[PDB]
C-alpha cells in the first residue's frame, strides 16, 4: 500500500551482444596434416601488435583491432 506499481519502465534501448563463433582461432587458422600454418588473414605490421596479432579482412579492406590500421 501507499504506492502504485505504474508499469511505466521502458528500458527497450537494446545494447549489443558479442557474437563469437566456437573457438574463432579456427576462423583464424587452417592446418593441413603435413603441418602448414596458413594464416588466412593479414598480420598487422605495427610495433605493438606485430607478428602475432592478426588483422581483420573485411569486404574491401584490412582492419586491425589494436591500432585500427586500415588498407584497401
Amino acid at each position: 500500500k501507499k504506492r502504485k506499481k505504474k508499469s511505466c519502465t521502458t528500458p527497450k534501448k537494446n545494447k549489443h551482444k558479442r557474437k563469437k563463433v566456437k573457438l574463432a582461432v579456427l576462423k583464424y587458422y587452417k592446418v593441413d596434416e603435413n603441418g602448414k600454418i596458413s594464416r588466412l588473414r593479414r598480420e598487422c605490421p605495427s610495433d605493438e601488435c606485430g607478428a602475432g596479432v592478426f588483422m581483420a579482412s573485411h569486404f574491401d579492406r584490412h582492419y586491425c583491432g589494436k591500432c585500427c590500421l586500415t588498407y584497401c
Binding site: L23, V25, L26, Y28, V31, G35, I37, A51, G52
Partner: protein, 123 residues
C-alpha cells in the same frame, strides 16, 4: 626424480602464478606461442573438438615446444587458478580450461629437474 610427472604440473603452476605466467584460455594461450617466448603447453586428452587438437599439436611441435599429457580438462582449471575456492579449501565453482601455456618459469629447482628429465628422454 622424487615426484611423478602427472603431479609435476602442480608446484610449477604454483610458483609461476606469482609472476603471472599462466595463459588461461585457448586463443590468447596460442597467441603467446606466436610471441615466440612461451616454454611449455599442456593438452588435455579429454577434448571436445577434433579440429582443436590438430592445430595446437601442429603449432607447438614446429616451434620446439614439448607436451605434458594430463587427461581431463575440467581438472586443469584448478592449478591455473580458474576455479573459486570454498570456505575450507574445496573448488566450489569448477571452471576448467583445455589449454595451459607457461611463459616464464618460477625460481626453483624442485620442478626444474623433473620437467627437464621428462624433456630430454624423448629427444
Amino acid at each position: 626424480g622424487v615426484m611423478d610427472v602427472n603431479t609435476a604440473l602442480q608446484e610449477v603452476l604454483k610458483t609461476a602464478l606469482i609472476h603471472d605466467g599462466l595463459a588461461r584460455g585457448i586463443r590468447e594461450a596460442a597467441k603467446a606461442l606466436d610471441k615466440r617466448q612461451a616454454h611449455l603447453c599442456v593438452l588435455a586428452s579429454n577434448c571436445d573438438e577434433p579440429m582443436y587438437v590438430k592445430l595446437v599439436e601442429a603449432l607447438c611441435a614446429e616451434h620446439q615446444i614439448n607436451l605434458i599429457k594430463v587427461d581431463d580438462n575440467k581438472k586443469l582449471g584448478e592449478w591455473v587458478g580458474l576455479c573459486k575456492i570454498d570456505r575450507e579449501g574445496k573448488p566450489r565453482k569448477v571452471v576448467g580450461c583445455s589449454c595451459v601455456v607457461v611463459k616464464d618459469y618460477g625460481k626453483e629447482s624442485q620442478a626444474k629437474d623433473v620437467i627437464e628429465e621428462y624433456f630430454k628422454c624423448k629427444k
